[PDB]
């Protein structure tokens, strides 16, 4: 019934300065009587259960620092963190407690700001034992780039297809705060022997020219 639109998707600001999150409601969450906006902000650390931060759209939960300020009314609501720390890395949800069914927002994820780092691209041809038992799968790796925004494109000596292209993105590193990604070209041994060049391109903000790594069969 009620839709909760959280904004933005995921911001990555450095520690020390204040950040803000917005939450729009498809209809007013303010009760006429007992005038209180039935909206709550929750916080969920990476790989854990969500913890409520703010309830009734303005008041904090006991045990939460006063840096988490919740405001807003009607349909627009805001949650600000005045001094971001390492203990604030999580994703945050706004939830309306006014109508049934109860609905959440998609959630805004908090990352750490960093400098741009080009990916380390390295392709790998299929193994010997993989061919004797099964087909052929090419492997491409993209290691330690910032930010997470990246795209991979294969090419088979002129041709190109998305069939058999399974990718895998990691999360932000808990040490150097970088992102990694893998890409596989699952084929069979049959149609693998009729092509020569197999390449794995990228597209990152660091270089105007993509990072290209190829190999001949």
């Amino acid at each position: 019934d009620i839709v909760m639109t959280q904004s933005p998707s995921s911001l990555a600001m450095s520690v020390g300065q204040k950040v803000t999150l917005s939450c729009k409601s498809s209809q007013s969450l303010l009760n006429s009587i007992n005038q209180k906006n039935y909206l709550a902000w929750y916080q969920q650390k990476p790989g854990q259960s969500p913890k409520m931060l703010v309830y009734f759209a303005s008041t904090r939960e006991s045990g939460v620092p006063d840096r988490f300020i919740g405001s807003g009314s009607g349909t627009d609501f805001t949650l600000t963190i005045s001094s971001v720390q390492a203990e604030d890395l999580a994703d945050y949800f706004c939830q309306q407690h006014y109508s049934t069914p109860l609905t959440f927002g998609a959630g805004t994820k908090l990352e750490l700001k960093r400098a741009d780092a080009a990916p380390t691209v390295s392709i790998f041809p299929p193994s010997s034992e993989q061919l004797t038992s099964g087909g052929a799968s090419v492997v491409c790796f993209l290691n330690n780039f910032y930010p997470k925004d990246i795209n991979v494109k294969w090419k088979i000596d002129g041709s190109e297809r998305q069939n058999g292209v399974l990718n895998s993105w990691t999360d932000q590193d808990s040490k150097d705060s970088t992102y990694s990604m893998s890409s596989t070209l699952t084929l069979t041994k049959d149609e693998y022997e009729r092509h020569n060049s197999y390449t794995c391109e990228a597209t990152h903000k660091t270089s105007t020219s993509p990072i290209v790594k190829s190999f001949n069969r």
């Binding site: 259960s49 939830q95 407690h97 390295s122 099964g134 799968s137 790796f141 990691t170 190999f215």
Partner: protein, 216 residues
């Protein structure tokens, strides 16, 4: 203090049913509502329904009226959710919460449910060498490709865990109803192929262990 303890993970098959628990210890159990939340990768959080272990018992979401029946035991503190007609899109983490006037504020540990018809199969691991025709500059990166296993994770280490610097393991990806992932490690060219580098993969489901060296 109040606390909600949920049942362990449930790896089951499609079409069948699943019932989980949620023990409520630390307060008057029959005096508060118990809500159920679903968190599925890619679809955020969803509310399934609440149950009051007193008089007026349950209240269900619209899309969760045929599936996910709710029951409570006022005698021994527990809250149950009975899922039915399990399809692949029911794989998620389910939390039980103690609902209140302004929200939940008290959550459970969580129960991860996974549904699939894939038979428990051990993985097949393949070394990933850069190839003789290459321009290996200083650091050389090697890989260990793990394909065709089910279920759970696979624990992958390099040289029995002695080599952990520059190691990147990627989350598993389902393919042909079987999981697949890979791992990468960067070592100096002065060490490889001068010294051997092995990836050790363990599948605790099928209880297998495979050590395969990376050869040029």
């Amino acid at each position: 203090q109040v606390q909600l303890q949920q049942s362990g993970a449930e790896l089951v098959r499609p079409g069948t049913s699943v019932k989980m628990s949620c023990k409520a210890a630390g307060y008057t159990f029959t005096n508060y509502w118990i809500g159920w939340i679903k968190q599925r990768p890619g679809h955020g959080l969803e509310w399934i329904g609440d149950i009051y272990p007193g008089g007026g018992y349950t209240n269900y979401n619209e899309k969760f009226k045929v599936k996910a029946t709710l029951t409570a035991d006022t005698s021994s503190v527990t809250a149950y959710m009975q899922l039915s007609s399990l399809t692949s899109e029911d794989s998620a983490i389910y939390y039980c919460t103690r609902e209140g006037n302004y929200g939940f504020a008290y959550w459970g540990q969580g129960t991860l449910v996974t549904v699939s018809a894939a038979k428990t199969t051990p993985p097949s691991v393949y070394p990933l060498a850069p190839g003789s025709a290459a321009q290996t500059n200083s650091m050389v990166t090697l890989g260990c490709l793990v394909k065709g296993y089910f279920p759970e994770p696979v624990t992958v280490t390099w040289n029995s865990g002695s080599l952990s610097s520059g190691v990147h393991t990627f989350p598993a990806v389902l393919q042909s109803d079987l999981y697949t992932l890979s791992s990468s490690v960067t070592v100096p060219s002065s060490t490889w192929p001068s010294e051997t580098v092995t990836c050790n993969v363990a599948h605790p489901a099928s209880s297998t262990k495979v050590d395969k060296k990376i050869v040029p």
